[PDB]
Amino acid sequence: NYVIWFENLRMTDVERVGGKNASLGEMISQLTEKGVRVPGGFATTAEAYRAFLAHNGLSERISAALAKLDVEDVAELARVGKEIRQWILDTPFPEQLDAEIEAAWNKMVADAGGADISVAVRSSATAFAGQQETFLNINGLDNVKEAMHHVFASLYNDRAISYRVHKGFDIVALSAGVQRMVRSDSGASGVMFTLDTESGYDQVVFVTSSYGLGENVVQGAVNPDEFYVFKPTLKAGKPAILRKTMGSKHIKMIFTDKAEAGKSVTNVDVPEEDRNRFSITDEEITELAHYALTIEKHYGRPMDIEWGRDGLDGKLYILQARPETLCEGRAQKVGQGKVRDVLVTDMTDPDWEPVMKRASAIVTNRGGRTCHAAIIAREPAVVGCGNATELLKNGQEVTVSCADTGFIYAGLMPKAPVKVMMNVGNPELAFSFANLPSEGIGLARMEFIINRQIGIHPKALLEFDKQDDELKAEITRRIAGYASPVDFYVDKIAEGVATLAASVYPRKTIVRMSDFKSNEYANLVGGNVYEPHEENPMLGFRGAARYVADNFKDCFALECKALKRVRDEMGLTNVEIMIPFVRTLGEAEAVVKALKENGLERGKNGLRLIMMCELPSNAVLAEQFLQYFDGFSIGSNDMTQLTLGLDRDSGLVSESFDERNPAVKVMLHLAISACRKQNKYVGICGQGPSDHPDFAKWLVEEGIESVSLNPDTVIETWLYLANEL
């Protein structure tokens, strides 16, 4: 009645032991047979806490103090809070609670065969983050009891007294969970989410990991390794890790031999070995992602989960699991209104709850997550702007974004006649566009992955051994966590492309192979020596000619190895491969021969092959080029430049650039007709349809199958076109 074992708790015991302990029992009792390993222990109950607090009778003394106390007088609140906490600290456990803890402790050491076990003593409130309060590596009975005293006192931490007065409430209790320690002090640990927190995208599992006890990743005291795993392909048993980001992993929490009270754990530097390694293996990331899903399937909602790899066992444990739910400040949701209605002020009392109702947004100088105004806006909301009173003006006219640095500008689906698809380059933004209404990605560009995730010329990696001490050293630095220089290149392209394809899966993602000019390959590390200066880069060594050049075929092979893995192993079959700058029919033919050499063929595993139609020759021999491909994506930028003989970046001529020049239109017509008479895909890329609505009109009238737009131009164009139909 005072102490309950986790194995006898269920999620229906939340009022008795709190959400954390109830959830622990729910997993132990229901999921251990589904493979989830949760450490054992016991919870104290809400009536244990009440009995404890009745003493002489402390409960009513606390209640008296809290009565006459302004929580928004920050002195009194610190003074009264400290006072209350010392009373709880100086109050002894009732005789029955001590005996019952002792008997439960004695059974734990009996279950552990021997033994000098250690435990976590955590706070499980009948109600965050947490400020919570937790104790780790607590080795004997009296330590455990004193760590429990502290947990009990934590209910009346100052912010907790506020948080409750703010949520508008007495007069409360909590439960202490006493759980066996997993030895991740010599292993690794972290936190998993069964959605992407940033975007909200729920088809992915997020796994963060570092060395040591997981308290550090939970608290953000360390920058951890971050991994994304794709749910559908993980369930089919295919390799499902989309993205690996190495954390700096500066420090790690370990055990002390020297445990006075909270000195049982300490932070220590991570060696440079471990720092530039990934802290868990692919097999582990995957194994954890499976646990995440069986937990989420069971609870029927998004989950936030703590886990640890025991450095003794080797085995992965789930430790805790719970449900997951100009000017600047702390930030989901956008909003609009006049700045006064967007309310701009220092910080709200509760007296600011009527006039708060008389308004439509809140932006405040002070505050963090559990700020007064930040809670009213959850039940929105930019807090923690040092000076918005200053920056923002009393007039108007603003709109307040949270799609988590909470900006504040400075501003303010029907049937479509074509398919509106996205033009996407940055895989770090991919899950934020999963959400946007589109028909997929009609141009997934490769150049951000190469510039920004890889950063090194593939021939420098291919010929690593011919460098350059200074360069061998730079490459090795950059390729940390990957098996070899060439494996880095393939792996990172696979990650980037799998990520983009996963974002809109199962929807079409047309991946353009690399469209770099040689001056862009020259800027990569190790690149200049392979990329001589050209007089006219727009017209130089790039595209198909580069892919099939003897001098560069081993690099093309690398990019092909990545795409093939993405489709053939990762099961991301929604990927089509687009080939740019195909100048002649001999090049078209050479490229399909090259792809074939590298295991990629039309019809094999459903592969579809698209040509970027961007040279005038592609238009006047449309039908002839089209035999080699399943369709065209028209690159109107390059088509316009070559038809009209212009560099649109040169200001001296570029006023004559116009995708809707009659000469360019003849070219588009030739291409789009050729495709139509073969019942073949024809799309167009470029912002022309967005920037010139009549061009969009002309394109629908020509029979274009799709249009590919920057995500932030997608809704407007869709609506314009739908309204026209």
UniProtKB/Swiss-Prot annotation:
Which GO terms of the molecular function aspect are on file?
A: ATP binding; metal ion binding; pyruvate, water dikinase activity
What's the top EC group for this one? transferase
Q: What InterPro entries does this protein map onto?
A: ATP_grasp_subdomain_1, PEP-util_enz_mobile_dom, PEP_synth, PEP_util_AS, PEP_util_C, PEP_util_CS, Phosphohistidine_dom_sf, PPDK_AMP/ATP-bd
Name the residues that bind Mg(2+). Answer: 614, 638
Q: So where's the catalytic machinery, residue-wise?
A: 372 (tele-phosphohistidine intermediate), 685 (proton donor)
Q: Name one GO biological process term.
A: gluconeogenesis
- Provide the cofactor list for this protein: Mg(2+)
User: Per UniProt, where does substrate bind?
Assistant: 445, 512, 614, 635-638
Q: Which Gene3D superfamilies does the record associate with it?
A: ATP-grasp fold, A domain (3.30.1490.20), ATP-grasp fold, B domain (3.30.470.20), Phosphoenolpyruvate-binding domains (3.20.20.60), Phosphohistidine domain (3.50.30.10)
> EC number(s) per UniProt?
2.7.9.2
This protein's pathway reads:
Carbohydrate biosynthesis; gluconeogenesis
Miscellaneous comment as given in the Swiss-Prot or TrEMBL entry: Present in outer membrane vesicle formulations which are used as vaccines in human.
The protein's matches in NCBIfam families, at most eight in alphabetical order, are given as: PEP_synth, PRK06464.1
Q: Show the domain comment.
A: The N-terminal domain contains the ATP/Pi binding site, the central domain the pyrophosphate/phosphate carrier histidine, and the C-terminal domain the pyruvate binding site.
Descriptive protein name: Phosphoenolpyruvate synthase
Q: Which organism is it from?
A: Neisseria meningitidis serogroup B (strain ATCC BAA-335 / MC58)
Please name the gene that encodes this protein.
ppsA
